[model samples]
Target: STGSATTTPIDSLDDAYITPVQIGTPAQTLNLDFDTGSSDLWVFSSETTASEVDGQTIYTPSKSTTAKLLSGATWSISYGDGSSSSGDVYTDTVSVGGLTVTGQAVESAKKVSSSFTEDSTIDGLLGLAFSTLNTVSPTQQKTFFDNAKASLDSPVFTADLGYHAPGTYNFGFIDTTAYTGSITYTAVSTKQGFWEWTSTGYAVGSGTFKSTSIDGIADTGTTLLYLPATVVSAYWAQVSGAKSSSSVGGYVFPCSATLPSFTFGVGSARIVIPGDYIDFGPISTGSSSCFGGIQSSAGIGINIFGDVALKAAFVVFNGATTPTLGFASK
Candidate 1:
């Protein structure tokens, strides 16, 4: 749950869909998880030797004249999947959009592993979620936006997700057009982007069942969509004559022929999952060109509505507010 920046939208999962911010001034590029679950801007460091470095733009402190290495302490972060890393902390001057935020602390993990390292085929992540998943006790450091918002001449982080289209998490300030014109916002439950919500029910266009509501939470921290067995199976049951494969995460369905378009209600607003979005990934359905888009999962626990699902709409998260999760365009 993100404390401040929480809310979501669907977008593509690729480099083209990501916002490229510089460490100093057009020197380096980092592929980060556009998360609403935590706030921090960290990247792999050049100091990390021996490990494989893919497309990640390693933060070479020496090159970033604006960088200030944290010579005293070390830091590490872990994902829900048990993958983790540890490293020394460093500070730097960062630029997003036209704003230059100074003294923002970045973590340079000493050791790293899990999907983030291998899948990225690259270096590190730059968290732009909420706040305080990093070093807070010293009371001097905050996330990129955390440090910048307090220091920015104006308190705003701009966003242009569409610019990073096809899919990717382009965070910062949101373009207001990313939301519904006639939607009502849900009050933020907490600054931690973890919002307390219940589904209106399984729907194609709008919604039909009002009684099947269940606990729903929006998240960008995950890449796969998790649904209860009932929701998973029921959704596929609607797909007649489609081939199902036990591939990737779950029962991969061939939705190329008869793709299903859907939307999730964030209070009064309905974020439509465009038909093209379902098959957003490269996994083909089978020999018939049936694309594997929406897969099935029996994640009955705390079901995570992953990045694949949110890449479709403009999500506004109000963390400064409380009690209810706020919703809006972008």
Candidate 2:
């Protein structure tokens, strides 16, 4: 079977893309971030402390007859941004779009970090990465996708993220209409528990392509694109009044400066990110300095092709025996 769902950007900045998911017997709909960088379908739930909860929706397993506690099971995950959540585990009927997965491990949050408490736009996260990355303890749990793959027409999912617009996530089948041109398929390494692949190279606007091999992960959870320092520096150099400032926390440029488009290679195919996409937003409200969407990944240790890059192309997370990634222009 196949399923499709609409993913909407939470804000104008496109900080996160949230999709409605149904949980338990009598469907309790909650908007969750479909994160491709991590594993573990966690949610803000009744188990969460009152003080830790904000205006976000919560999953009440106690109210669902089909929900069963996974005794002795627990999970905890900390993101690169320092946001963390930990909770007990429960097996329940979960549905995304029309795809159903029974006995899906639904982590019920008992505690959460300040960042999560403040961000009411998302009730929780639904991980799409490999189950090997699941943080559940005692007995590891498979992700919702892992459990539902066998019943799906094809064990694959596609992420069509948009820029300040509604996008879509399709399971079991690739939506050819969502993209243009032929798709470029690349080998994926799940050894790192991520949709990691090697990019051929990149180029600045109207510049010659660089024939360098760049290893990076395509992460829908992250907000920005992170590349090697050398590559990041080269891109910023093209923009007048651009500077990598420590105070600004990243590369910042004059709001009036013209930004250059960025192009990256996926095998023989090239995906170009519009120049305006790189101009993230002002460093501060009404500030003349704008932060860049592409930044150096030196500190991050690994390069990440996040929402900034994904929004510019159609991405497929193929869950075949030999996992592969497909990219196409949209």
Candidate 3:
């Protein structure tokens, strides 16, 4: 199967890219966040209590005759940002782009965190990570891609993320027209259930590339670029009036500061993030303080090439043997 889906940006969070998906028989369409960092196909559904839900669209399993309760099974997931969701499970048909997977496990949320309920645009999460990381209990569930891989011409997907703009997620095959230059493929370590890789080094602005290898993961669900604390400090120091703001929880700089580009390496590939992309946005609507999109991944234990950094290039999350990552200029 070969298909492509368009991704749109969330309003308040200038970083997420979401896609539309159809679930169950007769097709109930919902906008979902395709997250590479986790593995679970969950949604805001009729299982969720009325008061617990906000303005988000919900999936009604009762409306689909194909939906069946996964007996004795349950699911719960918590994100690094403290956001979480939990509920029962149902076996149903799931479709993305044009690929369809039958009898796929779909988690129906009975409860959700304020972060999720308040952000109504995202109806649920469609995890694209390795199926080993799925959160279903009693019986582990498979992701949409995993279940559909048997029918896919190639077990691969590409994340062509954009900078607060619409992008495409192509499945089964790569679209050469979406990127430029030769694609550089790098071996990835999937032991941590992520598309993790080591960067040869990086540089701030036009500075020389430092030979400090950084182990990091490509997380489409995340919003900012997170490096080591020392590395983050170095990048922030380059801008005047930049400081580690306790209130903001990351580095912040004056709105007037001229930002510098950040470049990181994948093998010999140099992926450079433009200066403007580093300045996330104003702390508040009218505030002069801007949050730095590049922050410290100190506590996380590994660096993260979130949406901000991934948007700089076309990324290939190859699920074939060895699970390699191919990058090219977008």
Query: Per-residue lDDT tens digits of candidate 2, residues 241-282?
Result: 999999889999999988899999999889999998888789
Clashing pairs in 3: none
- lDDT, each prediction: 0.52, 0.94, 0.89
| Cα lDDT of model 1 by residue, 22-72, tens digit | 675445655455555555556767866446444556778877777777767
Total backbone clashes of candidate 1, pairs 3 or more residues apart or in separate chains: 38
Structural similarity to truth (TM-score) of each candidate = 0.75, 0.99, 0.98
Flag regions of model 3 displaced more than 4 Å. none
Candidate 2 Cα errors over 4 Å, as ranges: none
lDDT-best of 1 and 3: 3
- Candidate 2 has an lDDT of 0.94
Using lDDT as the measure, what is the rank order of every candidate, best first? 2, 3, 1
Off-target runs (Cα >4 Å) in candidate 1 are 1-16, 25-27, 117-123, 135-141, 151-174, 177-180, 191-199, 205-214, 241-248, 280-300, 321-330
TM-score of 2: 0.99
